Amino acid sequence: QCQDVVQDVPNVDVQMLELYDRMSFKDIDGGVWKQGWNIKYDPLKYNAHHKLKVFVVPHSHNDPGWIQTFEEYYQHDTKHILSNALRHLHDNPEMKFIWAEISYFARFYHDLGENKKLQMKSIVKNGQLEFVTGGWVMPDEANSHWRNVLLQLTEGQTWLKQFMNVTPTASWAIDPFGHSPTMPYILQKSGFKNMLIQRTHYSVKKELAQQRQLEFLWRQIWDNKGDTALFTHMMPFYSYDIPHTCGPDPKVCCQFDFKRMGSFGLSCPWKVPPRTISDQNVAARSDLLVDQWKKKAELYRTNVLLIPLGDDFRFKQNTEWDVQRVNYERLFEHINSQAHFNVQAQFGTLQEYFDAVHQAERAGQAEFPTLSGDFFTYADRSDNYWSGYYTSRPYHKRMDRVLMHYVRAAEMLSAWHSWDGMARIEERLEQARRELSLFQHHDGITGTAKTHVVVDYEQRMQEALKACQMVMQQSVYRLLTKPSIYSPDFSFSYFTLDDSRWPGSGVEDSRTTIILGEDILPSKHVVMHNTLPHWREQLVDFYVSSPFVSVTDLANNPVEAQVSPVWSWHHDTLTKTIHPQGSTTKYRIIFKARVPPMGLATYVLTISDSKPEHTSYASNLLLRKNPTSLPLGQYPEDVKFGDPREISLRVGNGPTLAFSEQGLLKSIQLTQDSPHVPVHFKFLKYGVRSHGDRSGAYLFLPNGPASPVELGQPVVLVTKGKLESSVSVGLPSVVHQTIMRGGAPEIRNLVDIGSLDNTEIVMRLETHIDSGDIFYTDLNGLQFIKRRRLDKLPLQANYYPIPSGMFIEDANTRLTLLTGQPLGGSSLASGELEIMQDRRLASDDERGLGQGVLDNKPVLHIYRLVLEKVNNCVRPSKLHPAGYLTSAAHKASQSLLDPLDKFIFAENEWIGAQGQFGGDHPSAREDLDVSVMRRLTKSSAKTQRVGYVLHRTNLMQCGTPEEHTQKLDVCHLLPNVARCERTTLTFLQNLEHLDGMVAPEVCPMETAAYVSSHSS
Ligand SMILES: *[C@@H]1O[C@H](CO)[C@@H](O)[C@H](O)[C@H]1NC(C)=O
Ligand SMILES: O[C@H]1[C@@H]2[C@@H](O)CCC[S@+]2C[C@H]1O
Ligand SMILES: [Zn+2]
């Protein structure tokens, strides 16, 4: 049956948390290998019957945006690299080249004439040009959500299958800033057999090198059996550039980068230039180079050695192709003909290297270790830990998650039907997928690009959001209109999307008010979509032009609603206070929408001349000294005023929250009898060093622990309603909001760091929880990994990515913070959680970006806070490296990442309107998600095909019986199923033809893909 992911601790040779506890992390000078040691080898190791096989693998790192935009790099550099690669590989049959970034390759190939397309296909087919990974990008591994890692991988590999007829099975990840086990998870489920990584902490490289553990079978932290394992090669040295890839001595290796002799504007910082290889020097030059190779080979277990040959945007000029190729050819001729070296060296590809490694393994020459864990937080040297980019450019980090959801929703909503080409559905979805995929680049979501490049990514993402909205609203109109009435104009807006959290109140006033009135329009239809495969009820809100509005379902059943004011916060430069103003012409109406699995539900908003029977009105209390009046137009309850004071609130039967006089949480009481548990929010600031290394987009180099933000006497606004209550406070740089709807609170921070240079703003939670040095953070929204704070490491080393959540716990109590955006965070003392909100840095951090981070803009960060008793939960043992969410924390995460979508009908009357879609869809167990639903065929295909990605998480058992659900068989969601197949996660290979055309559900922590085929 399924593997147990909780109770059995895997036995692995290397467990990265255990390794971290034992390592000392001393930064001593190792000689020419500055972070290693002087490698020694026995010359007699190699001989006539046991040669060293060397693969020199030419490559070119092409960032899809960084210090230029994608299109700028394409025009100035990448199109010439690819054009000249085609020519030089064509003309030089033993030369090889690998290529990773399919965004660029697709941009290139589609501009080729057919003669050149054919020539390109021939050098791919014959193995000279080899694709590695084949994703749209080489993604960030820290901030990216696994769903978007899969999206971009699929975008690139689907392109490659269609146009190049190849599917890579080896991955190349030389530049992401630390590495995640989510990558082998996805890759192994996508047909891969091997992967390569580079940017791991220098101390880890030393430790694993000493044990010859740089090649390993990387399995997931919970995986007892090993079925998730993927063979992984970690490169051993400081960079992927030629000085750090031939061997341990960069002064020697630089002499073999033949672009550095002067005419190209490059040189060797170790002050010994390359020399052109001639018959007079080739023996000496070869003895230098072979000795470097044999030292590198000592770090690995086979007689097969990988030597990358490349750097950023290399292999551009024809003269560069020639100078590298001709000099290496002279070296190979000499080396391979001189028996005393016992070396056979050649240009090769990545797959060629791995195939030869595994041939050695099968011949019994090596056994590889098993490994679990991750490779965060990266440091490349000294105390320079790359935890800054977990937060840099947080606006765009948040935008990533918004677009993630709208791509899912657009693909799902439109998959139910086949569309005519004139509807431009496929066109808009392809654009949306590609812009989101581009942003997964390790200079996109990471916030490590130049200002104008960030603007380009943002503009692309905005176009993608508009594309999603168009597809979604067309789809809703089709799904909810009587078929014989449906008369679409595929350019028309039948609905507009309403999003309450993006860009957010205080960031952009982009929401449309529903305008009702006796002399204009009595009522309005709205529609909610639920992308999750279970019934959901959730409060939804809209802006309306009257407070006298009531809600009905499309059976005209009244729905209870609450009306509240529309409050906006202002930085009053004449009074020097931050305080709220209420609208006198628009109001918020809130009600519970109940929406089928993967379905839609319609409601109607109707105006009346007076308070309606089933609509209540929130009270409002402004706490501040010196108040002034707050008129609210027709809102029927007058605002109350008071001096600052502690307050407590409870919605429904839910928790009771107590707040300080400054508007910040102080305690949570779960039930009426129970203790008021201390849970205190605090905002603090980190600065920058005034000597030594400065923080920048990549690096976090604080000048000591954080200092509290001075709050003064902030203005606090309390809104109390039957359905929703909140406490909001205007603090320096942050409008902080705690919202209660009857379960776990929601936190919203409108963060505007303003002109506070050299400041990082952190939000900290202080509790009594006896967590010691342990805390948990997620990896890519997929899994939670145990962290241990290490006081032998500096503060910034104890920061980890928080892509979706974090928690601390003791024997009895857990506090989980779920996020709607990836940010950096830690637990720096027992009972604490902290998460960075924004950072503004005036200096560059000396990694090549050439600017600090001075382009901050207001961002609305969102969270859920879940305090729980966990003493009755079945948790992993103390030695297990994973943790798992409870039901309530998982649902709270889903609330943030995949909320209901809201649609407002744009015209005055919707003729043929229907009340619901998907009432017959199965309501699957809470731990299962349909992560992807995508129609894979256009309308001309006689056999339509729909793909599904199913993911089951693992939730802790805590004694909530929580049961009766329906089985979900995705292959029967559409009618006329003729076949159901299990596929790789990219949909590109059929793995099993399924009996009865039934797609089984998956095991906890597993992800599977299915394709259903339909004959009508
Ligand atoms: C793709 O490759 C397979 C074997 O590599 C070959 O049989 C086939 O003709 C190619 N199909 C295409 C070009 O779609
Ligand atoms: O962000 C950049 C990388 C970083 O490692 C700094 C050195 C250049 S690489 C190219 C970019 O992706
Ligand atoms: Zn890069």
Short mmCIF file of N, CA and C in Angstrom, two decimals, residues 867-957:
data_model
loop_
_atom_site.label_atom_id
_atom_site.label_comp_id
_atom_site.label_asym_id
_atom_site.label_seq_id
_atom_site.Cartn_x
_atom_site.Cartn_y
_atom_site.Cartn_z
N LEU A 867 -3.13 28.89 15.86
CA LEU A 867 -2.70 28.40 17.16
C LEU A 867 -3.50 27.14 17.43
N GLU A 868 -2.83 26.05 17.80
CA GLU A 868 -3.48 24.78 17.99
C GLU A 868 -2.87 23.99 19.12
N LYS A 869 -3.69 23.16 19.75
CA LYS A 869 -3.23 22.12 20.63
C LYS A 869 -2.89 20.89 19.80
N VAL A 870 -1.66 20.41 20.05
CA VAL A 870 -1.18 19.28 19.24
C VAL A 870 -0.74 18.08 20.09
N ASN A 871 -1.00 18.10 21.41
CA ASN A 871 -0.60 16.96 22.21
C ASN A 871 -1.29 15.67 21.79
N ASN A 872 -2.44 15.71 21.16
CA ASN A 872 -3.09 14.47 20.76
C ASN A 872 -2.73 14.07 19.34
N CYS A 873 -1.92 14.84 18.64
CA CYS A 873 -1.57 14.55 17.26
C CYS A 873 -0.49 13.47 17.15
N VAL A 874 -0.61 12.63 16.13
CA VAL A 874 0.39 11.63 15.86
C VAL A 874 1.48 12.28 15.04
N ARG A 875 2.59 12.64 15.66
CA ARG A 875 3.66 13.35 15.00
C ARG A 875 4.84 12.42 14.73
N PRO A 876 5.71 12.83 13.82
CA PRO A 876 6.91 12.06 13.60
C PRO A 876 7.76 12.03 14.88
N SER A 877 8.65 11.02 14.92
CA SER A 877 9.57 10.91 16.02
C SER A 877 10.56 12.06 16.00
N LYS A 878 11.27 12.27 17.08
CA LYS A 878 12.25 13.33 17.23
C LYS A 878 13.36 13.27 16.18
N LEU A 879 13.64 12.11 15.59
CA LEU A 879 14.71 11.99 14.58
C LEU A 879 14.25 12.20 13.15
N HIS A 880 12.94 12.30 12.96
CA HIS A 880 12.44 12.48 11.60
C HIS A 880 12.69 13.90 11.08
N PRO A 881 13.20 14.06 9.86
CA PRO A 881 13.51 15.38 9.36
C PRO A 881 12.32 16.19 8.82
N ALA A 882 11.11 15.66 8.78
CA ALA A 882 9.95 16.36 8.24
C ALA A 882 8.99 16.76 9.33
N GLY A 883 8.12 17.71 9.00
CA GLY A 883 6.92 17.99 9.75
C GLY A 883 5.74 18.07 8.82
N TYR A 884 4.54 18.08 9.37
CA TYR A 884 3.31 18.09 8.61
C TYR A 884 2.29 19.01 9.25
N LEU A 885 1.50 19.64 8.41
CA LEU A 885 0.41 20.50 8.83
C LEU A 885 -0.77 19.72 9.40
N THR A 886 -1.54 20.41 10.23
CA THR A 886 -2.86 19.98 10.58
C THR A 886 -3.85 20.36 9.47
N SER A 887 -5.05 19.77 9.53
CA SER A 887 -6.15 20.10 8.63
C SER A 887 -6.40 21.60 8.59
N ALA A 888 -6.51 22.24 9.75
CA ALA A 888 -6.85 23.65 9.79
C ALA A 888 -5.77 24.51 9.18
N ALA A 889 -4.50 24.18 9.39
CA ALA A 889 -3.40 24.99 8.80
C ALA A 889 -3.37 24.78 7.27
N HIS A 890 -3.58 23.54 6.82
CA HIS A 890 -3.62 23.31 5.37
C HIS A 890 -4.74 24.07 4.71
N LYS A 891 -5.95 24.04 5.30
CA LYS A 891 -7.07 24.78 4.74
C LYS A 891 -6.79 26.28 4.73
N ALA A 892 -6.13 26.75 5.79
CA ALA A 892 -5.80 28.18 5.85
C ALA A 892 -4.82 28.55 4.74
N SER A 893 -3.85 27.69 4.45
CA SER A 893 -2.96 27.91 3.32
C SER A 893 -3.72 27.95 2.01
N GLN A 894 -4.66 27.03 1.82
CA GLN A 894 -5.46 27.01 0.60
C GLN A 894 -6.27 28.29 0.49
N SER A 895 -6.77 28.83 1.59
CA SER A 895 -7.52 30.07 1.62
C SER A 895 -6.69 31.22 1.07
N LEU A 896 -5.40 31.20 1.32
CA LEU A 896 -4.52 32.24 0.86
C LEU A 896 -4.12 32.05 -0.60
N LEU A 897 -3.80 30.83 -1.00
CA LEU A 897 -3.24 30.62 -2.33
C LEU A 897 -4.29 30.41 -3.39
N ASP A 898 -5.40 29.78 -3.05
CA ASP A 898 -6.44 29.49 -4.03
C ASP A 898 -7.81 29.86 -3.49
N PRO A 899 -8.02 31.17 -3.29
CA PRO A 899 -9.33 31.64 -2.81
C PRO A 899 -10.41 31.44 -3.86
N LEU A 900 -11.67 31.61 -3.46
CA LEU A 900 -12.72 31.74 -4.47
C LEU A 900 -12.43 32.90 -5.37
N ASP A 901 -12.74 32.74 -6.67
CA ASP A 901 -12.71 33.83 -7.62
C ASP A 901 -14.08 34.49 -7.70
N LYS A 902 -14.09 35.79 -7.88
CA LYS A 902 -15.32 36.58 -7.87
C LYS A 902 -15.49 37.29 -9.19
N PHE A 903 -16.67 37.17 -9.78
CA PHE A 903 -17.01 37.76 -11.07
C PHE A 903 -18.25 38.63 -10.93
N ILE A 904 -18.20 39.83 -11.50
CA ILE A 904 -19.33 40.75 -11.51
C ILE A 904 -19.88 40.83 -12.91
N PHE A 905 -21.15 40.55 -13.12
CA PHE A 905 -21.70 40.61 -14.47
C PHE A 905 -21.68 42.07 -14.94
N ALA A 906 -21.20 42.31 -16.16
CA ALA A 906 -20.91 43.65 -16.58
C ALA A 906 -22.10 44.39 -17.16
N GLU A 907 -23.04 43.73 -17.74
CA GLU A 907 -24.20 44.33 -18.38
C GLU A 907 -25.36 44.39 -17.41
N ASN A 908 -26.48 45.02 -17.82
CA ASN A 908 -27.60 45.19 -16.87
C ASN A 908 -28.39 43.91 -16.69
N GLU A 909 -28.53 43.10 -17.74
CA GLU A 909 -29.32 41.89 -17.61
C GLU A 909 -28.59 40.70 -18.20
N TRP A 910 -28.54 39.60 -17.45
CA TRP A 910 -27.95 38.35 -17.95
C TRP A 910 -29.07 37.40 -18.37
N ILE A 911 -29.32 37.34 -19.68
CA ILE A 911 -30.43 36.49 -20.11
C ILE A 911 -29.97 35.04 -20.17
N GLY A 912 -30.75 34.12 -19.63
CA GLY A 912 -30.42 32.73 -19.60
C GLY A 912 -29.49 32.26 -18.50
N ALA A 913 -29.30 33.12 -17.51
CA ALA A 913 -28.42 32.86 -16.38
C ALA A 913 -28.83 31.62 -15.60
N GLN A 914 -27.86 30.84 -15.19
CA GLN A 914 -28.03 29.64 -14.41
C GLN A 914 -27.37 29.81 -13.05
N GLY A 915 -27.83 29.03 -12.07
CA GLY A 915 -27.45 29.22 -10.69
C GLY A 915 -26.21 28.51 -10.23
N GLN A 916 -25.81 27.46 -10.90
CA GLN A 916 -24.71 26.65 -10.40
C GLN A 916 -24.13 25.83 -11.52
N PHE A 917 -22.85 25.54 -11.40
CA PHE A 917 -22.16 24.60 -12.23
C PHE A 917 -21.33 23.70 -11.34
N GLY A 918 -21.32 22.40 -11.57
CA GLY A 918 -20.49 21.45 -10.87
C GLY A 918 -21.09 20.86 -9.63
N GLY A 919 -22.41 20.96 -9.43
CA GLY A 919 -23.01 20.38 -8.26
C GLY A 919 -22.88 18.87 -8.19
N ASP A 920 -22.63 18.21 -9.31
CA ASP A 920 -22.42 16.78 -9.40
C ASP A 920 -20.96 16.40 -9.37
N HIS A 921 -20.05 17.39 -9.24
CA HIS A 921 -18.63 16.99 -9.13
C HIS A 921 -18.31 16.35 -7.80
N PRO A 922 -17.49 15.29 -7.75
CA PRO A 922 -17.18 14.69 -6.44
C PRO A 922 -16.44 15.64 -5.54
N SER A 923 -16.75 15.55 -4.26
CA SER A 923 -16.11 16.37 -3.21
C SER A 923 -15.11 15.50 -2.51
N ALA A 924 -13.84 15.66 -2.92
CA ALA A 924 -12.75 14.78 -2.57
C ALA A 924 -12.24 15.04 -1.17
N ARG A 925 -11.57 14.06 -0.61
CA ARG A 925 -10.97 14.20 0.68
C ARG A 925 -10.07 15.44 0.74
N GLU A 926 -10.02 16.04 1.90
CA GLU A 926 -9.43 17.36 2.10
C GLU A 926 -7.95 17.44 1.76
N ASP A 927 -7.23 16.33 1.87
CA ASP A 927 -5.81 16.33 1.56
C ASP A 927 -5.49 16.18 0.07
N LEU A 928 -6.48 16.00 -0.77
CA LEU A 928 -6.26 15.82 -2.20
C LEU A 928 -6.59 17.08 -2.95
N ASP A 929 -5.77 17.44 -3.92
CA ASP A 929 -6.01 18.59 -4.79
C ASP A 929 -5.84 18.17 -6.26
N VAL A 930 -6.63 18.83 -7.11
CA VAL A 930 -6.44 18.81 -8.55
C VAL A 930 -5.62 20.06 -8.85
N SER A 931 -4.29 19.90 -8.78
CA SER A 931 -3.37 21.00 -8.91
C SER A 931 -3.42 21.65 -10.27
N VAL A 932 -3.63 20.82 -11.29
CA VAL A 932 -3.73 21.23 -12.70
C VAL A 932 -4.89 20.51 -13.36
N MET A 933 -5.72 21.24 -14.09
CA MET A 933 -6.62 20.67 -15.08
C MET A 933 -6.37 21.47 -16.34
N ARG A 934 -5.99 20.79 -17.44
CA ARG A 934 -5.59 21.42 -18.67
C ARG A 934 -6.06 20.63 -19.88
N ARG A 935 -6.86 21.22 -20.73
CA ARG A 935 -7.17 20.52 -22.01
C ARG A 935 -5.93 20.61 -22.89
N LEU A 936 -5.55 19.49 -23.46
CA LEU A 936 -4.31 19.32 -24.16
C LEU A 936 -4.45 19.36 -25.67
N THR A 937 -5.66 19.37 -26.17
CA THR A 937 -5.95 19.34 -27.60
C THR A 937 -6.79 20.55 -27.99
N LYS A 938 -6.55 21.02 -29.22
CA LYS A 938 -7.40 22.03 -29.82
C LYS A 938 -8.64 21.41 -30.40
N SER A 939 -9.56 22.23 -30.87
CA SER A 939 -10.88 21.76 -31.23
C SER A 939 -10.90 20.84 -32.45
N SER A 940 -9.88 20.89 -33.30
CA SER A 940 -9.85 20.07 -34.51
C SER A 940 -9.51 18.64 -34.21
N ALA A 941 -9.03 18.28 -33.06
CA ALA A 941 -8.70 16.91 -32.73
C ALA A 941 -9.94 16.07 -32.54
N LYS A 942 -10.01 14.96 -33.28
CA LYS A 942 -11.14 14.06 -33.15
C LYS A 942 -11.15 13.47 -31.74
N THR A 943 -9.99 13.14 -31.19
CA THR A 943 -9.93 12.63 -29.80
C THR A 943 -9.44 13.74 -28.88
N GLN A 944 -10.34 14.26 -28.03
CA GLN A 944 -9.91 15.30 -27.11
C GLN A 944 -9.24 14.65 -25.93
N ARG A 945 -8.30 15.28 -25.26
CA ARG A 945 -7.45 14.92 -24.23
C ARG A 945 -7.39 16.02 -23.18
N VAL A 946 -7.62 15.61 -21.96
CA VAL A 946 -7.56 16.55 -20.81
C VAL A 946 -6.59 15.95 -19.80
N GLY A 947 -5.66 16.76 -19.33
CA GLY A 947 -4.68 16.38 -18.35
C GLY A 947 -4.99 16.90 -16.99
N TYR A 948 -4.69 16.09 -15.99
CA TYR A 948 -4.85 16.42 -14.59
C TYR A 948 -3.59 16.10 -13.82
N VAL A 949 -3.19 16.99 -12.93
CA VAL A 949 -2.13 16.71 -11.96
C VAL A 949 -2.83 16.62 -10.59
N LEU A 950 -2.72 15.49 -9.92
CA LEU A 950 -3.31 15.26 -8.63
C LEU A 950 -2.21 15.21 -7.58
N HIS A 951 -2.38 15.99 -6.53
CA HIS A 951 -1.43 16.00 -5.42
C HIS A 951 -2.17 15.70 -4.12
N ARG A 952 -1.64 14.74 -3.37
CA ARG A 952 -2.14 14.50 -1.99
C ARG A 952 -1.07 14.90 -0.99
N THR A 953 -1.43 15.81 -0.10
CA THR A 953 -0.51 16.18 0.96
C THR A 953 -0.64 15.15 2.07
N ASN A 954 0.05 15.38 3.21
CA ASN A 954 -0.12 14.55 4.39
C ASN A 954 -0.46 15.43 5.57
N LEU A 955 -1.63 15.20 6.16
CA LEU A 955 -2.11 15.97 7.31
C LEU A 955 -2.00 15.14 8.57
N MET A 956 -1.68 15.78 9.66
CA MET A 956 -1.58 15.01 10.91
C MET A 956 -2.91 14.50 11.40
N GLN A 957 -2.83 13.31 11.99
CA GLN A 957 -3.95 12.64 12.66
C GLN A 957 -4.06 13.23 14.04
#
